[PDB]
Design a protein around this ligand. Structure first.
Ligand code: GDP
Ligand code: 2XG
Ligand code: MG
Length: 170
């Protein structure tokens, strides 16, 4: 089979995890997608000339059993840590997600990309400089996206694949 990357999209409810994922997969923007639905998507793409399969888990937070969260964190190779630029709490929540993924994988070397979504809105509580500072402290890229306009969306996902590649070649 073609090379396969397992990606997991995490972050506070309402930040745009579903909208980002559906924009990547189906190239349209979804105004309303039930906040409580968690689903694994598949999409064949070409990244740096490489035909590959993306398995993307669009997460929805708490699970029936915490075992289920741990399972997808161990399976996942890379994580999109998403906040919304007009939501400070969602930015603060990033610390929790960073910690929890490292904790479950018991690793200090977990491919991640920090994503500030909703960049199309003038309304902004988290400046680029603040987000850049956090990503720098993690040693990971920061990308601003808009699931609505599509800006930055392929970059967010493809960068995460490239981060996974760097980990795997070690
Ligand atoms: N303006 C704007 N709205 C967005 C963007 N991404 C998501 N939304 C809206 O934010 C709300 C929550 O998005 P959703 O994808 O369901 O967030 P999730 O809970 O993280 O899965 C929905 O009403 C979306 O239409 C974006 O990039 N720009
Ligand atoms: S689509 C998917 C399901 C589970 C998982 F851990 C992933 F990384 C992707
Ligand atoms: Mg959702």
């Amino acid at each position: 089979g073609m090379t396969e990357y397992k990606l997991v999209v995490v972050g506070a409810v309402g930040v745009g995890k579903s909208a980002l994922t559906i924009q990547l997969i189906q190239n349209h923007f979804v105004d309303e997608y039930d906040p409580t639905i968690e689903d694994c998507y598949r999409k064949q793409v070409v990244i740096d000339g490489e035909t590959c399969l993306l398995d993307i888990l669009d997460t929805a937070g708490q699970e029936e059993y915490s075992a289920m969260r741990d399972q997808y964190m161990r399976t996942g190779e890379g994580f999109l840590c998403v906040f919304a630029i007009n939501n400070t709490k969602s930015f603060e929540d990033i610390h929790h997600y960073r910690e929890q993924i490292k904790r479950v994988k018991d690793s200090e070397d977990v491919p991640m990309v920090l994503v500030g979504n909703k960049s199309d809105l003038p309304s902004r509580t988290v400046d680029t400089k603040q987000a850049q500072d956090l990503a720098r402290s993690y040693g990971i890229p920061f990308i601003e996206t808009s699931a609505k306009t599509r800006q930055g969306v392929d970059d967010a996902f493809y960068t995460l694949v490239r981060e996974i590649r760097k980990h795997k070649e070690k």
